[PDB]
Amino acid sequence: APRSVDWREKGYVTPVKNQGQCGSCWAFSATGALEGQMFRKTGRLISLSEQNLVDCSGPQGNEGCNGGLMDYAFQYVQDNGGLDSEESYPYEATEESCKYNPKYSVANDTGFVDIPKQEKALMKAVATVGPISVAIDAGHESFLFYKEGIYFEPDCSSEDMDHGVLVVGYGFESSDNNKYWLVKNSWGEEWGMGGYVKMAKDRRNHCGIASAASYPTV
Numbered sequence: 083a084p085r086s087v088d089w090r091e092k093g094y095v096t097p098v099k100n101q102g103q104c105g106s107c108w109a110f111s112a113t114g115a116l117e118g119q120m121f122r123k124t125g126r127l128i129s130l131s132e133q134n135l136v137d138c139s140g141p142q143g144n145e146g147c148n149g150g151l152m153d154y155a156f157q158y159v160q161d162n163g164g165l166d167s168e169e170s171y172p173y174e175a176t177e178e179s180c181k182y183n184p185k186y187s188v189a190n191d192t193g194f195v196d197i198p199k200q201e202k203a204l205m206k207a208v209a210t211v212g213p214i215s216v217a218i219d220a221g222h223e224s225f226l227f228y229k230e231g232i233y234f235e236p237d238c239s240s241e242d243m244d245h246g247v248l249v250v251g252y253g254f255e256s257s258d259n260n261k262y263w264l265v266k267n268s269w270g271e272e273w274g275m276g277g278y279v280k281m282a283k284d285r286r287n288h289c290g291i292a293s294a295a296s297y298p299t300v
């Protein structure tokens with residue numbers, strides 16, 4: 083359980099992406115985790131198709147630009163036996179008809195692991211496994227206009243999450259509660275710290291970050 087962790091440094095994270103005006107954070111989150119877990123199994127980092135997820139994973143109970151869960155996406159790739167590359171199946175930001183092509187598949191998974199609902203367990207996973215899909219409470223002006231430092235919103239909810247993101251590490255600064263999660267959001271590089279956000283860690287599961295954490299098995 084190193085005191086600090088950043089999976090970017092290890093070649094597990096792709097660049098920050100833009101979801102645009104569409105309810106598909108859950109897709110970006112899930113390709114984030116799959117990107118890293120594939121990169122652990124194979125050492126090739128390949129960007130994956132959110133459009134594929136948005137378009138094709140209705141049967142798993144996702145709902146395109148109207149929402150879905152990372153767990154349904156991980157299911158979809160198991161159910162479907164593959165997921166296409168970003169290059170082969172580019173992000174359109176609407177919801178179209180399934181064009182999944184099995185010949186351009188680059189990732190597959192054998193299920194997913196739901197993390198216990200605690201920050202200690204999250205931290206283990208982030209340190210042992212790689213980047214983790216999580217859901218957070220992002221329904222606040224403060225998040226929307228975030229810019230730097232350690233995000234703390236007194237109004238944030240431990241259990242009512244409305245946005246999926248990726249945890250790519252954690253660290254601490256240099257008075258009292260100094261610790262944070264390194265979180266990769268999908269709103270383009272403009273937003274906050276290069277598209278990233280240093281969420282408050284170990285302050286009572288702030289924004290519910292530890293509350294629906296998972297990753298795929300590959």
Ligand SMILES: *[C@H](N)c1nc(N2CCOCC2)nc(N(Cc2ccc(Cl)cc2)C2CCCCC2)n1
Pocket residue numbers: 104105106107108143144145147148149150151216217218243244245246
């Ligand atoms: C992520 N972009 C997102 N968007 C939305 N909505 C935006 C469009 O208007 C409806 C809601 N909702 C979620 N969301 C809640 C949810 C909706 C539908 C389903 Cl099948 C599952 C969840 C997610 C909750 C789980 C963590 C990610 C956010 N997300």
